[PDB]
């Protein structure tokens, strides 16, 4: 969408609300599959809540976009290459826009807390450019996201539960390799409303479950070779103190001459499940992570759907 020029990136909406436009600074990629990142410091120091996102993408050039909150972006520059980087501290995903899979709105009453003493001080925007045939006129791209911020405290607070593999090894030619992740939940209740899967080219299927008294309840199941948007949960699912969260990525090693481990390049793999939730404001925390497998034997009773392509 058009570069903003003289009016700048901040639009006053109310005596308590404003829109912040986070856009690439007129970039022109020279190669296919280029990842550009840029950052924006929040204009306010006090606590604010992110309550809406509007995509400002070219429907010709942009393949996907992600928006993160963090305190230390990887570069102090105007823009940089980030094949998967973003920040030096923890990059907290807030929004995904995927071509051919339209985003779903935040439920009303729900917001991410940012700024203040403990919230993100920066937004970091990652834009993935696919086919660069539309850049033949050498035009400058200002694609990005418009974010609606308010100072009005929200009754429900949005957060992310990230489940990720660390130790996976996929030997070459191997028909099937499973990456299993599991943790005990020990916070106040969260309600999952959306999910995103992330794998590289070897991933076949990713599934996430809440396990309670041995019973498996589906959160999300998706082919990671399909556009990696945040997809809505079929049915709102609570996760409560005592529950186990379990996830499985199914990989193959076929077409590879050497072993494939977890890493940041296309020659490596990832097994990431992003579980987007809301919590009551007075109970809420903004992020949780599972990088372990605390109940490995539990996976004997995983539903069969977790083992076959969607």
**Which chain residues interact with Ni ion by CB under 5 A?**
238
Per-residue binding string, Cu ion, 51-70, x by CB under 5 A, is ------------xx------
d(CA 120, CA 48): 10
Query: Contacts by 71-77 with C-beta closer than 8 Å and gap 24+?
Result: 71/120, 71/121, 71/122, 72/122, 73/37, 73/39, 73/122, 73/124, 74/37, 75/37, 75/39
d(CA 43, CA 45): 7
249 binds Cu ion (CB under 5 A): no
Tell me if residue 201 is catalytic. no
Rounded to whole angstroms, what are the CA distances from 28 to 36, 38, 39, 125?
10, 14, 17, 16
CB atoms within 10 A of CB 82: 22
Residue 177 corresponds to which tokens in the numbers above? 């390799």
CA torsion 46→50→51→54, rounded to 10°?
A: 130
Residue keyed to tokens 């392509």: 309
Contact 38, 79 (CB under 8 A): yes
Residue 179 corresponds to which tokens in the numbers above? 């990456």
* DSSP assigned state of 51: E
Name which position in 23, 56, 113, 128 contacts Cu ion (CB under 5 A).
128
| Residue 200 annotated as lining a ligand binding site | yes
Tell me if residue 198 is catalytic. yes
Tell me if residue 200 is catalytic. yes
Minimal distance, residue 91 CB to Cu ion, in Å: 12
- Residue 93 contacts by C-beta under 8 Å, 6 or more apart in sequence? 66, 67, 68, 160, 196, 274
| Residue 64 annotated as lining a ligand binding site | yes
Minimal distance, residue 134 CB to Cu ion, in Å: 15
Residue 248 contact partner, candidates Ni ion, Cu ion, none, CB within 5 to 8 A by sort of partner:
none
Q: Which of 56, 57, 120 is nearest to 93 (CA)?
A: 120
| Residue 148 annotated as lining a ligand binding site | no
Minimal distance, residue 31 CB to Cu ion, in Å: 14
Minimal distance, residue 248 CB to Ni ion, in Å: 25
| Residue 63 annotated as lining a ligand binding site | yes
Per-residue binding string, Cu ion, 159-198, x by CB under 5 A, is ----------------------------------------
Q: Do strands 144-150 and 260-261 pair parallel, antiparallel, or not at all (unpaired)?
A: unpaired
- Which listed residue (40, 154, 198, 288) is catalytic? 198
Minimal distance, residue 256 CB to Cu ion, in Å: 16
- Which listed residue (38, 64, 154, 288) is catalytic? 64
Q: Which is nearer to Ni ion, 46 or 280 (CB)?
A: 280
275 binds Cu ion (CB under 5 A): no
- Which listed residue (38, 40, 160, 270) is catalytic? 270
Q: Which is nearer to Ni ion, 240 or 266 (CB)?
A: 240
Q: Which of 50, 49, 42, 221 is nearest to 122 (CA)?
A: 42
Tell me if residue 65 is catalytic. no
- Which listed residue (38, 40, 200, 276) is catalytic? 200
Residue 63 contact partner, candidates Cu ion, Ni ion, none, CB within 5 to 8 A by sort of partner:
Cu ion
Question: Three-class SS of residue 157?
Answer: strand
**Subset of residues 253 to 272 that bind Cu ion, contact rule: CB under 5 A:** 270
Q: Show binding-site residues for Cu(2+).
A: 63-64, 128, 198, 200, 270
The footprint of Cu ion (CB under 5 A) covers 63-64, 128, 270
User: Which residues are tagged catalytic?
Assistant: 63-64, 126, 128, 198, 200, 270
Indicate the annotated binding residues.
63-64, 128, 198, 200, 270
């Amino acid at each position: 969408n058009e570069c903003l020029g003289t009016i700048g990136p901040v639009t006053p909406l109310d005596a308590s609300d404003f829109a912040l436009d986070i856009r690439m600074p007129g970039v022109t990629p020279k190669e296919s599959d280029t990842y550009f990142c840029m950052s924006m410091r929040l204009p306010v120091d006090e606590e604010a809540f992110v309550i809406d996102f509007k995509p400002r993408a070219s429907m010709d050039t942009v393949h996907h976009m992600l928006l993160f909150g963090c305190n230390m972006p990887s570069s102090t520059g105007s823009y940089w290459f980030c094949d998967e980087g973003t920040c030096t501290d923890k990059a907290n995903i807030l929004y995904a826009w995927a071509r051919n899979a339209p985003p779903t709105r935040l439920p009303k009453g729900v917001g991410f807390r940012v700024g203040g003493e403990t919230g993100s001080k920066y937004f970091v925007l990652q834009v993935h450019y696919g086919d660069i045939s539309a850049f033949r006129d050498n035009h400058k791209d200002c694609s990005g996201v418009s974010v609606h911020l308010t100072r009005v405290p929200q009754p429900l607070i949005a957060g992310m539960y990230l489940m990720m593999s660390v130790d996976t090894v996929i030997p070459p030619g191997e028909k099937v390799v499973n990456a299993d992740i599991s943790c005990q939940y020990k916070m106040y209740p969260m309600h999952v409303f959306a999910y995103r899967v992330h794998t590289h080219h070897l991933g076949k299927v990713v599934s996430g479950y809440r396990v309670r008294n041995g019973q498996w309840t589906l959160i999300g199941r998706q082919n990671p070779q399909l556009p990696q948007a945040f997809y809505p949960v079929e049915h709102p699912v609570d996760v409560t103190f005592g529950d186990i969260l379990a996830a499985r990525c199914v990989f193959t090693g076929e077409g590879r001459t050497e072993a494939t481990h977890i890493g940041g390049t296309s020659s490596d793999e990832m097994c990431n499940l992003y579980i987007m939730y809301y919590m009551e404001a007075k109970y809420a925390l903004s992020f949780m992570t599972c990088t372990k497998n605390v109940a490995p034997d539990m996976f004997r009773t995983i539903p069969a759907e977790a083992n076959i392509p969607i």
